[PDB]
RNA sequence: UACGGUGCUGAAGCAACAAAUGCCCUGCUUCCAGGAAAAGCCUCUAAGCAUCAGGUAACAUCAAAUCGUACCCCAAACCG
RNA sequence: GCUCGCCGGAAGACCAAGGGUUCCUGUCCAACGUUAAUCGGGGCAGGGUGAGUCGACCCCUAAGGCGAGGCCGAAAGGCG
RNA sequence: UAAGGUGAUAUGAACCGUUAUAACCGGCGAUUUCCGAAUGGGGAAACCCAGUGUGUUUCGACACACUAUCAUUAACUGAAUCCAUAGGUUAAUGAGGCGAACCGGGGGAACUGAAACAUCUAAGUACCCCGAGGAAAAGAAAUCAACCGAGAUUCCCCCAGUAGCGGCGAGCGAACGGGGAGCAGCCCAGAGCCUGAAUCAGUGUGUGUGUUAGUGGAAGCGUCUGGAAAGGCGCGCGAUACAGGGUGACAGCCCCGUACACAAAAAUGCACAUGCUGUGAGCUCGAUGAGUAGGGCGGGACACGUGGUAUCCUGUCUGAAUAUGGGGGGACCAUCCUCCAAGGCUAAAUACUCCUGACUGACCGAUAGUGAACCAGUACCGUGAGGGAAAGGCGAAAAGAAC
């Protein structure tokens, strides 16, 4: 039946998206903790 | 936050105390009310954020360091 | 005069593909891997600068690699950009 | 410096990345694209030689 | 340094028929040497379907740990030493005991 | 060609009738819930200028990048 | 191949967001795939989608978001 | 610094060296794409689009250069607006984002305890917000102390579980002073005499010795088991060197090493002298920290919780004196002692590890030890914040198995 993912990008990419991620208060601090972390991207969105 | 600007004066640490004896927080701030006034330096009138006190701090100390202090901070006036 | 070379490094081989070996009939126009580094603005007026070559029309295509080579990891075989050039007859390159 | 002085100047050389890349470079473009280079060494004999030149512009040949 | 250079004559303590020696080719830069005549092994190598293979055995000479290996005498089929000590500056090999830098 | 097609060339190519989901139609009538904005676009004028630039009409003529373009597609190429 | 049964406002054909070479050809046997595989949408080697006009961008705007100067908040941050 | 090398998967291919461009190591620089502070102007992570100049030809256009705003300050200009101010156009200096700890200030719980709860406990503890430096912060007595005296501060141990506070419940809890480490103190509201005098900071040099780019370093042979020994047999030898690893079943003498020694354009730790530069000792007179010291109301931090209650602070009203004065000393008063607030700075004895090097663990040795001893925060799960593995070990050795 219907599922709660439905794809669209557009709203993907300013939902999870990393440029109001990067200019916003806590969305800096995901960034932070994932360069602690090491992780080989910070961004979801690709 | 509001502040005066020649003073220095900022919030304060208080309680209620009474009604009930707690030790529960209230927020406590100075009342400002600004002065408009001459400094002969400047070649104008100029409006300065003051609370209570403050315009009489103006009226008898010595302000050019302060003058210079919220430039030193880049604080507009 | 004609824009400064001192950066000029157009075309990156001479290639061999099916496409002009099995489908082509007229020499009118020869095709050619350039690569990340060309465009149809410049691939019509700059290689006459560094080769000996008369063009009149062009073409570019992106091309993409597929996807995957051996693994090792999925990686990828690269895109190599195509390219579409003047010739009409013979060989220019 | 002795022969090195002799007949090269630095308003010539302030010229070399023209001429190195309109001549030394060019004949070798796209030859490992035909199967004609394959001496892995014919390119790197000319690199470095403008990137000399391109500091030696603002770096003293000296202490 | 490795004492052995690069084209000494090697007594080789290995292996088991002692009376035979071997000759330095090349050194790495691991704990490993290069050698002729080292143990003889023949190898024929799994065989590949498509191009020209050279086949058979490769009788190649093989690598061996550079601590089983020292110089050969030249006097009584024994190892020797070489040394890398001079006073008055670099190294230079003198068989432990020479009046010359050689 | 003893054959995968070949690839030059060509006849008839008209009329009624029924209807849009299409066109005249960002038409008309009618209803009352009166149903985005701005730029490109068209004009008026300031500045700018006649060394021209710009405009109208006609003839010539250059490039027009950037990324896209395959395929699945109401689906074993989208999601379960 | 031939004959049979079914859909046919779909079970046909095209498409935007969706994904992005899964297209076309040869080849594979190992893993996978509701049995079995000689088959592949899974693997390997080859072949390919060219634009001023069609898509997106270049230019415009709604709801809304962000924002020098100006303001609020310990502050981060928020308005505008 | 050397006679051999040109990264790894990794083969394959091709060359580069002996002496200066083989390879490369240390220092000081050059160059430093797009996104990211991210900043010419815009954006939905690497895309989109200008302004202002210079130069030049055949001038349907390239090459090269400069450019967020904010703040400080100046210049030029300039609205209402006369003087002026914003606004406009530039320049010089400065913040901005980041790895780690230490560390300064702010906002600040609930859990838990009182064997229920409400002041109190817990606790200025977590989490959060801003942020600086080699350290941060501390700082040169309107201070303690009790009539004897001490004479900035920090750290360590005592002081202490002592005093003091407590729905006097449950509980809380200093400071003075002592021991040790350690030992720079000064300036302005002024300026004459004095003159670079005291005391430190920055930098150069030399001496002594470590560090840094580096690597030379004594002695073992035969024979036996066995695939092969360093074991076993026989006998020596070096040892200011028997640490440990590696090397074919027990190595000081096979190899690396060890002890030891050499190693410097230039930089640096530590000791010690000194060339240069900066600060600038000393004398005397004069002045001296006011809308504040307090007081009132309502509160805070001090161990102290409206008490007999002090200190220090202050939202807010009020407000006094200058040495013939004022503060503090557990209400308050008198006495007496002891200081000079309402002005400004500062040395290191202390703390710590992004990062460079070294030494130690009856440390673990793979259901152990860090999410991982292997292209592991990878594969992979989720819309997302977030979460997230599995396979160590052939043998002396590819000797990797032709025919």
Known sequence: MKRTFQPSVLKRNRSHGFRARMATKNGRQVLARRRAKGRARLTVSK | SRVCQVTGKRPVTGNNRSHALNATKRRFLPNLHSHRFWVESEKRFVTLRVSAKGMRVIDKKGIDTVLAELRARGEKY | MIREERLLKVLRAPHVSEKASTAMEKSNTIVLKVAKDATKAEIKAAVQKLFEVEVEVVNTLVVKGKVKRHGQRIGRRSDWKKAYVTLKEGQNL | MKAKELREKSVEELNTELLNLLREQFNLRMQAASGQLQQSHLLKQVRRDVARVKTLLNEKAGA | ?102
């Open chain 5, 1 to 102: 340094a490795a004492k052995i250079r690069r084209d000494d004559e090697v007594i080789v303590l290995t292996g088991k028929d002692k009376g035979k020696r071997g000759k330095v080719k090349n050194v790495l830069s691991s704990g490993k040497v290069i050698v002729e005549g080292i143990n003889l092994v023949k190898k024929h190598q799994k065989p590949v379907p498509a191009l020209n293979q050279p086949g058979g055995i490769v009788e190649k000479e093989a690598a061996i740990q550079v601590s089983n290996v020292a110089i050969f005498n030249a006097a009584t089929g024994k190892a020797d030493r070489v040394g890398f000590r001079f006073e008055d500056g670099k190294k230079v090999r003198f068989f432990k005991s020479n009046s010359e830098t050689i």
